[PDB]
Structure formats: C-alpha cells, structure tokens
Enzyme design. Structure first.
Site, short mmCIF file in Angstrom:
data_model
loop_
_atom_site.label_atom_id
_atom_site.label_comp_id
_atom_site.label_asym_id
_atom_site.label_seq_id
_atom_site.Cartn_x
_atom_site.Cartn_y
_atom_site.Cartn_z
N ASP A 64 -27.80 3.35 15.97
CA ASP A 64 -28.12 2.63 14.85
C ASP A 64 -28.60 1.36 14.33
OD1 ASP A 64 -26.38 4.18 14.29
OD2 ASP A 64 -24.76 2.88 13.93
N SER A 94 -33.73 -1.70 12.11
CA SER A 94 -31.65 -2.41 11.74
C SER A 94 -31.74 -1.26 10.49
CB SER A 94 -31.18 -3.12 12.48
OG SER A 94 -30.36 -3.30 11.61
N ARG A 95 -30.64 -0.29 11.35
CA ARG A 95 -30.50 0.34 10.33
C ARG A 95 -29.60 -0.17 9.28
NH1 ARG A 95 -32.57 5.93 11.92
NH2 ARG A 95 -31.62 6.87 10.31
N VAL A 96 -28.26 -1.10 9.23
CA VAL A 96 -27.89 -2.10 8.45
C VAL A 96 -28.27 -3.07 7.79
CG1 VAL A 96 -25.81 -1.77 9.64
CG2 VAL A 96 -27.32 -4.26 9.97
N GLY A 97 -29.18 -3.31 8.20
CA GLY A 97 -30.81 -4.38 7.46
C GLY A 97 -29.99 -5.63 7.37
#
Ligand SMILES: Nc1ncnc2c1ncn2[C@@H]1O[C@H](COP(=O)(O)OP(=O)(O)OP(=O)(O)O)[C@@H](O)[C@H]1O
Ligand SMILES: [Mg+2]
Lengths: 261, 132, 59, 169, 118, 254, 118, 85, 118
Positions: free
Chosen positions: F177, F202-205
C-alpha cells in the site's frame, strides 16, 4: 545501452525548451530596448534625407555580431557580406565588434582587419559602450578621413527572418558639401559638421547593434524550437527501440532457460 | 505644418514623438531659441540646459544631458536627447554636490580624463542651477 | 569646457554628461535601467593583424 | 519482415498520419507495388505519371522547410503543389470512387489547376467538379471508362473542362 | 596492387568523406549544420553530393524510376569520383547527382536544373 | 544497494521508544526485525546499535543469515509474521520489518529449481507472487470486536540498476500500500534521507497522519511539486520572473 | 563517530562536488561549457582538479607509470583536500594535480611547471 | 568477455578508425598490454624518454578534441602534435 | 453513423478547441492574455469555459462535499455543449460552469452569482 542515450536525449529536450523560453524573454527585452534606438535612427536618418549628400563619402567598415554564437545563420550572412564587400574593394578595413565574426574572419584576408572588441552583446544594448566605441573609433582610427563608413548588421525585418543591411555615414568633410546644406543657418563657432558626424556615427552604430542583438535573439529562439522538435522525434524513435530491445532480451533469457530444461 | 511637433526621445524610452507644442526652449551652444511654428530649418548643438516644453496644459521643464536641436522646413523639430529631468523629482542636491566635490579632485588627472571631469563638474553646476 | 583637443570627442563629452545625469539622478529614479547604463564591461583588443594589439582594454 | 518478403508489395498506413486527418493514411514513400504497375489502367498511367514524383519532392523538401521564409520559391512551388495533392487524395469510408469519376481529379491535380484553390475547398472542388463533369461533359467520362485511356483529343477536352470549371470555381 | 594506386586512393578518400558525415550525424540531427566548422560543412556537403551520386538507374527497374537504365565503366566512374573529390564540382546543386551516370551527366542535369527548375 | 533502506526502519524502531517506555498500550509499538540472508556481523553491529539506544527491550530479531540452509531463509518471514500476529491478536500494536525479501525469493527459487519444479520468468518459481501475497496480507488492522490489534509491514526490496520493472519488484509493488523510493544520486547530492518524494506514494494518504502534519503538509507538497517543475531553470541566470525564483528559493530551502 | 567530524564533512563535500560535476556533464559536452553560471563553472574546475588529484603513484606501477610511488598519510590527504575544497589552491593548473602525492607535491609540480614553461 | 579476461592484454581494432584512414585501426584507448617496460626494446623506452609516456599523450589528445576545446597556445600545440602523430 | 452527425460535430469542435487552448497555454503562461489575437482570446476563453463545464456533480459525492448530483442526459449534454460552442454564453463567468450539470443550471448559477453580487 540504449537507456543512457535516451536519457541524454531527454536532457537535450529539456535544455532546448528552457533555452527557447529564456530566448523569448530576452527577445521581449531586446525589442523593448531596440524600439527607442530605432526611433533615434529614424529621427535623424529621415532628416539626412533632406540633405541627401549621398556622395562618395582607405575605407572603414564596421561589422555587428553577438558574442554568443550558439546558433543561427547570423554570422554566416555577416561573413558572406563582408567577403563580398572585401573582394569588391580589397583596401577597405574590416573593423568589427563582438567575437564571432572575428573568428569567422581568419581564412578570408585577415590583414585589413584593424579593430577587435568582444564581450559587447550578452546582456543589453546599452549606451555607454556605444559611446566609448564611437569615441575611440574617432580618436584612434580617425574615422573622419575614411570615405565610406559601412556598418554590417542584421535587420530583424520579421519575428523570425533576418538579413544584413547597410547604413553609410557621411564624413564631416562632406556633410558640409550637402546640396541642401545652405538652408541650415550654421555657425562656424560650434563646428557643427564634425559634431554632427560624430553624433551620427554614435547613433547609427548604436541602433545597428541593437537591431543585430534583437535579430540574433530571435534566430536563437527559432533554432531552439527546431532543436526541441528534433529532440522530440529522437525521443520517440529511441523509446520505441528501447521497448523492442527489452522485450527481445527478456524473450532471449526465457527461451534460453526453456532450452535449459 | 500646423504648429510645431517635437520628437523628443530618450534611449530608454521616447518622451515625445511629434506631440503638438505651443513653444520649445532649446538651450544651445549659442543660446536658447524659441521655435513654435513654421520657422526655418536649422542645425544646432544642444548645450546642457533646461529644454522647457511650453504647452497649453503647462510649461513643463526638462534639463537635457546633451543632444542636437535640428529643424526641418516642414515645421519639424527633431530634438534628440539622452537623459531628461522629469518634472522636479530628478532634483537631488546632496549627491550632485558630493560628486562635484569628490571628482574635482580628479579634474586634473589626465588630459582627456581631466577635461571630461571638468565638463561633468560644469554640467553638475548646470543641474544645480536647475536644482533651484 | 574643451572636449575636442583637451578631451577626446563629442561622443565622450556627451557620454560623460549622460553619466553625470544618471549618477546624480535622485534615489527614486535609480532603477535597473540606470544600473545597466552604468554597467560597462567591454574589452578592447584591437586585433594585431599587422601589429598593435590592445589586449582587452577595459571600457 | 517475413510476411513482406513473402508478398508482392505492401501498403503502409501510418498512425500519426491517421491522427492528423489524412484518412487513407498511406505512406507513399514506404508503400510500393512490385507488379501492379504493369496491370494499372493506362488512363491512370497517363494522368498519374508524375504524382509519385510530386509527392516525393513534396516529402523531402517539406522535411527541409522548418521555417516560414521565402526558401527558394521553387521549393515553395513544390509545397503549394504537394499540399493540394495530399488533400486531393483523401476519401471517406464506404464511398468507393470508380475510375471514370477518378481520372479527371488526378488530371486536374497534375496539371496545376489545383494550385489556385484554397486547401479548405479542395474536397468541395472534388464534389463540385464531379457534379459539373457528370452534368455537361458526360461523354468524357463515358469515353474514359469505355475505351480505357486518354487520346490527345481526349486530353485536350479534359484540359478544356478543367480550365472551364476552375474559372467558375 | 590489384585495382591500382589511383583507384585505392580515390576509394579511401570517398570512404573518409562518407564516414565524416556519419560521425557528425548526431550533431547535425539535433543542433544543425550551422553549428559545425567550415571544414566540417565542406566535408558534409561533399559527402551529401557523393552519397547522392552513388545512385544509378537500372535497366531492370526503369518502371520503378522512369529513367532508362545506364551503365558506367570503371575508368569513367573513378575519374568522376576523383573529380568530385577534388572540389571541381561544388557549385553544382546536390540534386544534380541523383539518377545519373558519369560526371558529364551530372553537369547536364545541373544545366537543366538551373535552366527551367531555377 | 547502499541507499539507506535499513536506516529508515532503524530510525522508526528508535522513534518508537518515546511511547514504548510509557504506560498506554495503545501507543506502544513493539518491533520485530527480520534478517534474511544478511551477513552475521551485520546483524551483530545492528543489535549492538539497538542496545546502544536502549531499543532492545521492545525489539525481537529473527536472523536467517546467508549461512543457514535456504529453507530456513524461506520460513523466517513467516515465523516473524506469526510472532507479530501474536501481539496483533492479543490487542497490542506491533511493527514488523521484513527487510530483504528479494533474498527470500532467491531462496524460494533455489528450492523450486532443486525440486525440479517448472521455472518461469528468469527461472523464478511460479508461486512467488502467491508466496509474497500470503506473507504480506497477514499484516492488518483488526477491528474493535477482535481486540483492535494492528500489524504494520515494512518490506524492503532491493532493485538492481534501478529497474523497478523487474519481476519481483513488480509483484511486491502491486501487493503493498505505497512505496518509499530511495535513490543513490539523491544520496550523492547531499540529501541524506534519499526519499524520492516525486515517486514515493502512500495509499492511505493523510488519513493515518497527525492532524498538525495534515494542516502543514498540503502547502509543503505543492511547493515541492512546483520546485521540481521549475528545477530546470537553475543552472543559469534563472530570473524568468519573480514567481520562478520565489519557487526555487522556497523549494531549495525546503 | 569514527573518522571525525571534519573528515566526514570533507568527504561529503568532495562527494557532492563530484556529483554536481557529473550531473552537468551533458551541458558541458553536447551544448557547451560557456553557457553556465559562474558558480557552475567554478564547481566544474574544482571538481576536475579534485578528480585528477585523486590519482596517486603506485610502487608496483613503475613498469607502466614510470613515476616513483607515493604513500600519503591520512591527515595529509584530509588537509590537502580541505584546502582544495575551500579554494586556497584554485590558481594551480589541473595538470599539477595529476599523478601526485600530497598538496606539497602539487605546489612543487606547479612551481616546476612554471620552471620549464619559462 | 571470457577471452578478454583470459589473455595478457588485447589489441582492439574497430571499423570506425579503419574508415577514418588509420590502417592499423588500433584503438589506443582500449588496446593495452599487461606488460610495459618488460618485453620492450630499450631503444623504444626510457632512453627515448617519451616512449615511456606517449600513452598519456594520446589519451589527452583524444581528451580535448572538441569537448576539451582549445583554450590557449598549449592546447593548440598539443592538438597539432597529436594529429601529426 | 452511431452518435449522430451533430454529436460528432460538437465533440470534434470541443476537442479541437481544447487542443488549441492547450497549445496556446505555453505563451499564456509566459506573457498572459495580451499576445493572443481577438479570435485566439475568444477561443482560449471559450475552451476554459468548456473545461469548467466538463465537471458534473456526483450523486455518490452527495455526502462528500455538498453538491446535488444530476443525471444529465446525453441529449441534454450535447445540447448544452453546442449552446456553449455557438458563443452566446460568453458573458456568463467561467465558474458558473464549475460543479454544474445542465446548461439551465449554468444559467441559474449565473443568476445566483448576480444576486449575491448586487
Ligand atoms: N541518515 C543517514 N545518515 C548518514 N549516513 C546514512 C544515512 N542513511 C544511510 N547512510 C549511509 O548510507 C550507506 C548505505 O545505507 P545503509 O547501509 O544504512 O542501508 P541500505 O541502503 O539498506 O544498505 P545495503 O543495501 O548495503 O543493505 C551507509 O554507508 C550508511 O552509513
Ligand atoms: Mg541495508
């Protein structure tokens, strides 16, 4: 091995784009500086049409080129003009400004050349440099005694096209011989002919150098745009080649390992 | 022509490009001459002085740094200039006096340089006259 | 004063007068343009095709 | 490579050409026929003798024209001819032209009649010229489709029709 | 020893002229010919003239060219190439060397090109 | 290689000490390091440094060095994952550093080839994508009903010659991720943490970020993007109006 | 923590200077060195001087080099490269840095080059 | 690669120098011998002086062809020397 | 043949206007709006309006910011885009197309902007 060359062409494309942008900015600056110099030129040249003179007045000839010669056929056209006028009259001097026409003037009769000044056109036309150059032309090379004063410079006729053109300077010994000289109530106290001649030389040389600066910058911008599109085509072709190469090589190791079985 | 048109221009930017003028002062080597309409063609050297551009709006003045005042028979006044005196903001007494005092020391340095230094002191005193 | 014999030429006299106006111009008038006018970095070499090379004489 | 080596010629279709708007998108320089030249109808042979050459010089000279200046005006003549030739060769899908309504267009494009007409009106010229010819000079197309070639009197008649319509166009 | 000293020198100089072009291709392709030196410009234009002059019509492929096939003897072609190498023909347009035989054909083609084309 | 990949993980392990010595278990983050095919002396220096900063107490190290049999190097990540899952299922929060997974894939290659299994792309076994998926998916954030445990995985994949298109890099990048790209030229220019921000993602941000960092980071990322865009106008006069020079100054000081 | 703070600083600065030099290799080579800023140029000459200063004589290389080998001690190298980094020795031509020992050998080589250069 | 790693040096020849006129076409940049002073006639050695160090001279003359453009008279002298050689 | 002649026409005009606007964006960034001719300025402004009008509120983004999503029919879409294309909506500001569905919604948003202005 193709990847490094592709990266180099990427960098070349970036350099060309940046150079054309800064060339656009410098073109704007040069044009806004050159408009006033052109005004100075015309305001006295159309008046010199009234007192035509245009007589025969061994010879002093000036050439205008930029210090930076990265691209453009500017110096080539100046060179062909100077070679033509040199073979027409072999006794004429080859006074120049800048450096590029100086290096271009080695293989074609490098003895009539008298003056050489570099580091002129790199930031702005300016006026102090022109005044100093004209002053030491008058003081050292006694320009008033030379019949024809031709100044080699490129006309920025269009936003992309240019060609050399000439502006002659009447000597102080002959501005007083103008057919229309009588209608001016001159005074012998102020020695108007020689002062007029010196001011004329300064103004027209300044305007010619400003016009050459503008034309050179425009040609540089066009050359950078051309290099940009050429680099883009090169990038496309080498990207295709790199993709084909990587696919072919990976097929090679796969088929080799299959034959391993 | 109808009245007089003045091509007062400066290498940084032209000031006038044929604007109609009621009267022009041209401080010259001999003396200032008022040209306002028709007149005769003339060639003359502009000594550093107040080239006041009298107009119906106002008689705004300009101290010139030098140039040539020339006239054409078609009622044309070609005045070529280098540096003007915009209104009165150009006035700065302290630095003018500082240059005059500091460089009159080198007013006797070397023939040409000495003469140019003396001339610059003279035009600084001209500015002082314009300083008022 | 005298700028022909005592000086160099009318061009030098006019340039010195212009430098007078520029350097003595008031503070708010000072800008990039007058700095460029003051700026001068030319070098007079006077190529010795026969002789007399000035060797980058400063402006 | 192998399928070209097995065939008797190829017709190259270029993607960037298709993107520009040239609809056949056939790269004349690359596309070639090895034995179809001997079979081509002789009328097209006569009218289209120099189209390959014209498109050739229009290709390399345009690759030389990277600037909008005077060039040589012979190079400019070649560009102003090749642009009309290229715009002439466009067609549309599901609209197959027959030879009898084809040959006069090639003749008009090779005799220089197309030079005056603007680029935006080239297809307009094609349609209007076809209607004009089928209206009055029907015998011309009838003869060029029956006999199969252009005689000298037929060439003169076709030329006269071309200048007749060009003046009205 | 076999083909002759003159032929060997002519072939060597032709190889040099043609190889300079390939060496400078990368500079020419991106920047352009105006960024080259005067000697480089002379060599590249001579190379262009040469490589255009190597072309020759064939009596078999006249249908694909429209020009009747032609044959050139060895003594004629070596002399023509040496004449071009010496610089005897540099005012001639480069296009005049395309689909020709001897140097006389180049001269004739240049004559026609200057006559009606230009 | 030699980019500082392990340094980021080690700095994280040290940074966790601020709350690992507290009382609130929801802030404590236990750490487990995985040594796959690494030199034993490297592990010795590593553990020495961990004790020097008193991070040893909340850290567990599984060491499958290059000397041990390849199957042990194949199993070490899974046993470390089970060790972390103990903490995760017991309601605590644990940090797992898989470190070298390329060496683990190489070990699996050795195993599969020596067992006459059909090879694949550069002779890698088939179920290596499946292998890494099983390994990486075990880390998760448990819901409240199960104990609200968590396992945060930090695999370290070394790429050869910058080829992020290689088979194992392509497999692992699809699993994870977000990525932290570390470059050598960035390390050479003086940027000591060589995180290539233009490529790292970063996917979750910002969802799992400190709120102050969220408040102050949007302008930061915008300024960095603009500075990268205008980075070409630096090696010359570079005036190109006040906007470009302001962006250059802001980005370079950032 | 081992080589000392000053040694680490010198090593980092020389490494980043070589980095900057090799990053600008394209600009210098294909475009030209005259279109650079003053700082870019100064860094270029400094990095060139450093990279040819990295060359050292080898005792077992007399068969190839022909120059007696040199062994330069640690602090000698650190001080010499720090001095070159700062700019105290920018006037010395690059050739005096080639195939030498410490900066004292560089000074000796520069003086002797001035000697036979007359 | 195997043969370049197995031999006691190499003599590189390439077609590009061959078409440049150099008939031996010896790429002195890559062509190297693992033995220098040893296995060499002394007359072509330290007694001639520069025959110890023409390798450096031919490296530098190639090292300033256009990228190392001629700066002063020393560069012009080295250029002429190298091309004559 | 599929979407209809008018749909093809409007789509082609929209895409070419966007392409021309993108091509002029460089000189817009350099100088601004002055260097463009009157038709160039008109095309740039119209393409900016089209770019803003491409946006549409989402019925699944209701909870996201605040905006009521609209199921704009393809016939309504083509009618609205061709109406903007014809050039009778230049006085409507660009932001009246932003986060807006049907063209009547553009009109209503312009009216509410006017109401909140004066
Ligand atoms: N933050 C840092 N400060 C100083 N030096 C650092 C830093 N990060 C990395 N280095 C140095 O960079 C080099 C390589 O980094 P390091 O060995 O820590 O990690 P790595 O890239 O995972 O290594 P390897 O690929 O050899 O396993 C070492 O010399 C190390 O000291
Ligand atoms: Mg590491």
């Amino acid at each position: 091995e193709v990847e490094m060359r592709l990266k180099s062409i990427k960098n070349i494309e970036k350099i060309t784009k940046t150079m054309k942008i800064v060339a656009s900015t410098r073109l704007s600056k040069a044009e806004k500086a050159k408009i006033s110099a052109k005004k100075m030129d015309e305001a006295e040249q159309l008046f010199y049409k009234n007192a035509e003179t245009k007589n025969l007045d061994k010879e002093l000839i000036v050439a205008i080129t930029s210090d930076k010669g990265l691209c453009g056929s500017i110096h080539s056209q100046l060179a062909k003009a100077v070679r033509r006028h040199l073979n027409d009259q072999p006794n004429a001097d080859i006074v120049t400004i800048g450096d590029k026409i100086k290096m271009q003037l080695l293989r074609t009769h490098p003895n009539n050349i008298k003056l050489s000044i570099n580091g002129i056109g790199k930031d702005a036309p300016t006026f102090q440099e022109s005044a100093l150059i004209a002053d030491k032309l008058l003081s050292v090379m006694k320009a008033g005694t030379y019949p024809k004063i031709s100044i080699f410079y490129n006309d920025p006729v269009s936003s992309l096209s240019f060609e050399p053109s000439e502006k002659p300077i009447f000597n102080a010994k002959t501005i007083e011989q103008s057919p229309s000289f009588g209608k001016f109530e001159i005074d012998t106290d102020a020695n108007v002919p020689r002062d007029l001649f010196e001011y004329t030389l300064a103004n027209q040389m300044l305007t010619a150098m400003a016009q050459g600066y503008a034309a050179e910058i425009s040609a540089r911008r066009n050359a950078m745009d051309n290099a940009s599109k050429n680099a883009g085509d090169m990038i496309n072709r080498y990207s295709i080649l790199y993709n084909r190469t990587r696919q072919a090589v990976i097929t090679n190791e796969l088929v080799d390992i299959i034959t391993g079985a | 022509s109808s009245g007089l048109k003045l091509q007062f221009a400066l290498p940084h930017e032209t000031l006038y490009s044929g604007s109609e003028v009621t009267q022009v002062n041209l401080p010259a080597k001999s003396g200032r001459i008022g040209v306002l309409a028709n007149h005769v063609p003339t060639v003359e050297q502009l000594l550093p002085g107040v080239v006041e551009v009298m107009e119906g709006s106002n008689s705004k003045k300009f101290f010139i740094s030098g140039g040539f005042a020339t006239v054409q028979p078609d009622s044309q006044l070609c005045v070529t200039a280098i540096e003007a005196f915009p209104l009165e903001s150009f006035s700065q007494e302290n630095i003018k006096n500082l240059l005059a005092e500091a460089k009159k020391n080198v007013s006797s340095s070397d023939a040409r340089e000495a003469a140019e230094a003396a001339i610059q002191v003279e035009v600084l005193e001209n500015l002082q006259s314009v300083l008022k | 004063s005298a700028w022909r014999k005592a000086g160099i030429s009318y061009a030098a006299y006019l340039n010195v007068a212009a430098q007078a106006i520029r350097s003595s111009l008031k503070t708010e008038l000072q800008t990039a343009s007058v700095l460029n006018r003051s700026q001068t970095d030319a070098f007079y070499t006077q190529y010795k095709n026969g002789t007399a090379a000035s060797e980058p004489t400063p402006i | 490579t192998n399928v070209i080596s097995i065939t008797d010629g190829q017709i190259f279709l270029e993607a960037e050409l298709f993107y520009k708007g040239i609809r056949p998108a056939i790269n004349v320089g690359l596309s070639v026929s090895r034995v179809g030249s001997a079979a081509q109808v002789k009328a097209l042979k006569q009218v289209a003798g120099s189209l390959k050459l014209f498109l050739a010089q229009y290709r390399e000279v345009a690759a030389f024209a990277q600037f909008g200046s005077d060039l040589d005006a012979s190079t400019k003549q070649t560009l102003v001819r090749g642009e009309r030739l290229t715009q002439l060769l466009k067609q549309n899908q599901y609209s197959p032209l027959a030879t009898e309504e084809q040959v006069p267009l090639i003749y008009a494009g090779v005799n220089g009649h197309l030079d005056g007409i603007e680029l935006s009106r080239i297809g307009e010229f094609e349609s209007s010229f076809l209607s004009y010819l089928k209206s009055n000079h029907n015998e011309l197309l009838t003869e060029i489709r029956e006999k199969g070639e252009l005689s000298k009197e037929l060439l003169a008649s076709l030329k006269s029709a071309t200048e007749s319509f060009v003046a009205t166009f | 020893a076999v083909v002759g000293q003159e032929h060997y020198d002519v072939a060597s100089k032709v190889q040099e002229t043609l190889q300079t072009y390939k060496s400078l291709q990368d500079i020419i392709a991106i920047l352009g010919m105006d960024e080259l030196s005067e000697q480089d410009k002379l060599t590249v234009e001579r190379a262009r003239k040469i490589q255009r002059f190597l072309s020759q019509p064939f009596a078999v492929a006249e249908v694909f060219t429209g020009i009747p096939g032609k044959l050139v003897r060895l003594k004629d072609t070596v002399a023509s190439f040496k004449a071009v190498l010496e610089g005897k023909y540099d005012n001639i347009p480069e296009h005049a060397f395309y689909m020709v035989g001897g140097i006389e054909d180049v001269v004739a083609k240049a004559e026609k090109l200057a006559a009606e084309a230009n | 290689r030699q980019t500082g990949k392990t340094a980021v993980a080690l700095d994280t392990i040290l940074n966790q000490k601020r709350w690992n010595n507290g009382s609130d278990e929801s802030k404590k983050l236990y750490c487990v390091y995985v040594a796959v095919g690494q030199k034993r002396s490297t592990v010795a220096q590593l553990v020495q440094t961990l004790e020097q900063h008193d991070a040893m107490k909340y850290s567990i190290i599984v060491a499958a060095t290059a000397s041990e049999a390849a199957p042990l190097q194949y199993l070490a990540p899974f046993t470390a994952a089970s060790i972390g899952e103990w903490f995760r299922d017991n309601g605590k929060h644990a940090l797992i550093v898989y470190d070298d997974l390329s060496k683990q894939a190489v070990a699996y290659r050795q195993l599969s080839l020596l067992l006459r299994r059909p090879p694949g792309r550069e002779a890698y076994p088939g179920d290596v994508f499946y292998l890494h998926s099983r390994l990486l998916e075990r880390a998760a954030k448990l819901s409240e009903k199960e104990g609200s445990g968590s396992l945060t995985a930090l695999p370290v994949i070394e790429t050869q010659g910058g080829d992020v298109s290689a088979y194992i890099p392509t497999n692992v990048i699809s699993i994870t991720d977000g990525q932290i790209f570390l470059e050598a030229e960035l390390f050479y220019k003086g940027i000591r943490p060589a995180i290539n921000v233009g490529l790292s993602v970063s996917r979750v941000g910002s969802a799992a970020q400190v709120k102050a960092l969220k408040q102050v980071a949007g302008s930061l990322k915008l300024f960095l993007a603009q500075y990268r865009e205008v980075a070409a106008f630096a090696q010359f006069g570079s005036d190109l109006d006040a906007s470009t020079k302001q962006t250059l100054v802001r980005g370079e000081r950032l």
